[PDB]
Amino acid sequence: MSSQVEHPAGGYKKLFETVEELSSPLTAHVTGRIPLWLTGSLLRCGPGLFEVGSEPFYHLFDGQALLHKFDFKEGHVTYHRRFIRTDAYVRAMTEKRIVITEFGTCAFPEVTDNALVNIYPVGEDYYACTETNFITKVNPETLETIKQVDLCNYVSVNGATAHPHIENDGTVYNIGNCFIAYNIVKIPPLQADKEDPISKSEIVVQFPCSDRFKPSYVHSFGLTPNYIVFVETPVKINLFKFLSGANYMDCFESNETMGVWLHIADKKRKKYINNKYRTSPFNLFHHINTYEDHEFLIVDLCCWKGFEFVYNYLYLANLRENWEEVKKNARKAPQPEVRRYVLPLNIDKADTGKNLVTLPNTTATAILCSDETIWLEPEVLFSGPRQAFEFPQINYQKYGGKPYTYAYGLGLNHFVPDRLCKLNVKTKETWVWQEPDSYPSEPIFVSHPDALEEDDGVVLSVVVSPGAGQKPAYLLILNAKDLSEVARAEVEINIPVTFHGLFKKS
């Protein structure tokens, strides 16, 4: 984890304030020691332009995509940023108004390609994304925009999430609504022929939908060597309002009675498994990690307890209020909670009415009912009052899809990011890093090249630190063992909020 800090000075407003791009990199002023093995680029996306002249964007996910880069070499750091030249951005600069409708901002007189959320590798290319059918190829060294790619030209999905899984050979998996099913897309690694791997995309498996005409909102999914896990939540997209001045936010509604349905598919045999896993209602944005343990799937999730859509609390006008009002507005919101679910793969009918989770080191349960639903209860890993452990990250390259111990997160305090967190998912111990009037971003883990343990490395986070007598922002490097500060690299300009990113080793 929880925060130990209030924010009466209101400096978090700087997360939502327009900035200018740079024509070339700035030096960042280092205190402490940037690790000498840290060589590469931290790339992150977020909104950077929150109005077009006098026409405002309304929602957190509406501002125009800005691509950020911190470069690390021989203990020195540079910072650079450029707006992504999407259709939405280019046409707004051309027409000097809002041209394309964004998530929560209707344009007055066409799907947005405003790639403000994340960036990921496919073959030798990098793509910025949002959650629509459009992803944007970008140059990871210059930050120039290369092209728009319409996924519908290649595979049958209406969009895809900003959280594809990336196997170590470069294979990319993602999930998207299909207008009704949810399809898993597979993009292969770059082959010797050197054709764009996107032209070899295919649907490998399909998940069913709980409601013929109302697909659930899907933000992420789970992946192991052998299974795919999809969590169908009660936040629904109303297709009647969707396909007919509305925005994307206007199409969401909450199904009160379904709870949460969980789904697994066999990855290698490409087959849906008809096990009716059921539990109580929550919103889910981020899976933490998933893995197999004696024919149970361990599913670690960042949950929000309730069926109301958490995105209702993320209009900019609400996030820009003073601190007492931010706290008040969050009082009726779903409560965040880190939960471990355990999914049995071997359902014996003779165990009807009993708990199937026979593993020795969990309190998660799964009860086989007579109608063949399997009712699940979680083991709670972390819970604090309006204190979200969010934007989770792990040592992904070595522990993604595998038994693991540690997650890192951004701690939200009534939605305001104000700390960095580490959770031991076996012992439930936590570690916190936090300073007054400091607003971090998602932490990204980078392994030490000679690592023996899971947490032998660092996390990188971009921190907004307003108020005079500090420079406006900095790159923070924490030791992953205990979250103690190893270095920071201060820059002389503001940085707005960023969502997701990656570290590109060079």
Next chain:
Amino acid sequence: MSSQVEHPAGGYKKLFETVEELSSPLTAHVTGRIPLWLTGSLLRCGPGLFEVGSEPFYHLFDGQALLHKFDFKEGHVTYHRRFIRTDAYVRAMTEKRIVITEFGTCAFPEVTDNALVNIYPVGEDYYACTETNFITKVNPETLETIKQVDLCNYVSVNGATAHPHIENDGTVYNIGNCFIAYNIVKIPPLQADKEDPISKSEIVVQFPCSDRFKPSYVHSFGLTPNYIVFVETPVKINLFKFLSGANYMDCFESNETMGVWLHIADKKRKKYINNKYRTSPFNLFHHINTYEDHEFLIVDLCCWKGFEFVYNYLYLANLRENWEEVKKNARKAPQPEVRRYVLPLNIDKADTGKNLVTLPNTTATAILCSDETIWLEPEVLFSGPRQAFEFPQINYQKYGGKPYTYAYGLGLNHFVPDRLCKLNVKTKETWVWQEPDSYPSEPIFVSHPDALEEDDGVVLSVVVSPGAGQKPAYLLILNAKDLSEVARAEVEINIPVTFHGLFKKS
């Protein structure tokens, strides 16, 4: 909290072995120093005779009631015990066989009054009880049996729990099935006329039942200055099989679809409040404490996650198995979990779809649905794998029904009691006391008489220690602050399992 000990020597079997009563008190040999302010009697009930000749009792709750007493005066301790002369016991000694059917043992050729569970004060009298219509007046100084009282002679209930609440003026509240509703019985304090307060008992309020013909099993309930809280679980008593060689165990079944329904009544206005609180399925035996905080009831519970009846795992044949087998048999049982539920008393229709729990210090939620059900999620206070925090006790005289911080419990390890626990319900910190091959009982808290703080006192537990090179049993006194040992008083005979009891100050 969890246990750090295995039990391969199997000494826990001594909890379930017949003992002989004493004709008068033994000296208990003190090591350490019994506090000189500790003056009174620890009175406890449990089974003491587990067969009648060659006819065995089968279930944990079948053995013949044995009343135990440890006396404390001027740093010296005595131990004494006598079988309660119930109908079941007297008629078994007379006929030299099992005459009355017990909970899980059918008698071959009449409701049991085998008061093996608890003892409580009414007026100037003490009653041993089970959960039927019969309670047994006993002498707290000599342990003689005085008389049988049939509650049906006085009030309209078919039985009453072994966990009545006792207000500071001596008023006694209890709950019982009525054959369908659940009735709250009120027994007044002793008045100046000095008539038996049981003759002035009355039903003050009635709770509805979820199923016209199947009442829920009820073990305890919650009480605050202003409210009564009743938790209706999915463990049902099948009245068709009940009123028709069956035993009590044969009448239980699990409702798979209802989950848990929670109910509140206004204590002072004697009125049921029609708020449809709902959550997922669990067994509940023991409420920990209940209290009011602004317009919310805080309901702390010892839960078992699942709808299968936990009593199925408590046949003596299963509890007498070797350790590897005990662990295996408990693998499919419901998982124990301490949970805090928060119940809103102010339901505004305008908050439909939202979380009503606006308190600042909890992650529990309550969601108002369109059908007017209020779906609840708990804040988990403690959770360990088959590690139950059970038989909870608090500083009841000063904090029962009130805001509080500390609970004490008996820790079960795959159902085997092997440790004592303390839980801070605000911070979730725990403390443990445990020794190898030592099987404690429910801890009872006794305040220093001049205490101003909540945990300024001791806990007492009866410990069975069958390891050779130790005496067979002892009374344990721990400091309530940190569960460090203050003293123990060893006795030279075995003591079987005991369930509940009290400390009678003198």
